[PDB]
Amino acid sequence: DTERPVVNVPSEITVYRGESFEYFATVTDNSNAFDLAKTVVRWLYSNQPGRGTEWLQYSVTQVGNQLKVRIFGNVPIDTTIGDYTRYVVATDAAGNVNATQTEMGNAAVDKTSVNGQFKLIIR
């Protein structure tokens, strides 16, 4: 298997201070199998949710041949509002990833996006 998985996520997810949120991303792959230990919702620098979005959580289930990545959390009242680039990073059973760290960095430089990239919009 040399074909990488493909994530389907809303380009932008809008959340609000003092409120809970729940969104869903879907992942497919030619193999229909995934490495859940290597599937995460994270910011650019590490597998963490990120500064100012420390409360961003995720849960992974599989329904048929598709991953269902739940993107959820509760937004504290004292949150800094703004826009936060985050990523649904998914790995198939063979270790192919939807977006590499180099692809993510290149896209940030060029003000563009990679597969699985989305904006968490806090208002």
Ligand X SMILES: CC(=O)N[C@H]1[C@@H](OC[C@H](N)C(=O)O)O[C@H](CO)[C@H](O)[C@@H]1O[C@@H]1O[C@H](CO)[C@H](O)[C@H](O[C@]2(C(=O)O)C[C@H](O)[C@@H](NC(C)=O)[C@H]([C@H](O)[C@H](O)CO)O2)[C@H]1O
With CB under 6 A as the rule, give the number of residues binding ligand VP1. Answer: 3
Residues 81-120 within binding reach of ligand X (CB under 6 A): 82-85, 105, 108-109
Q: Is 23 in the site for ligand X (CB under 6 A)?
A: no
Q: Is 45 in the site for ligand VP1 (CB under 6 A)?
A: yes
CA 65 to chain centre: 19
Binding-site member from 2, 11, 46, 112 for ligand VP1 (CB under 6 A): 46
Give residue 51's identity as a one-letter amino acid code: R
- What are the CA-CA distances from residue 28 to residues 7, 56, 63, 75, 77 (Å)? 7, 23, 11, 29, 36
Phi, psi of 108 (to 5 degrees): -60, -40
Where do contacts with ligand X occur on this chain (CB under 6 A)?
43-44, 50-53, 80, 82-85, 105, 108-109
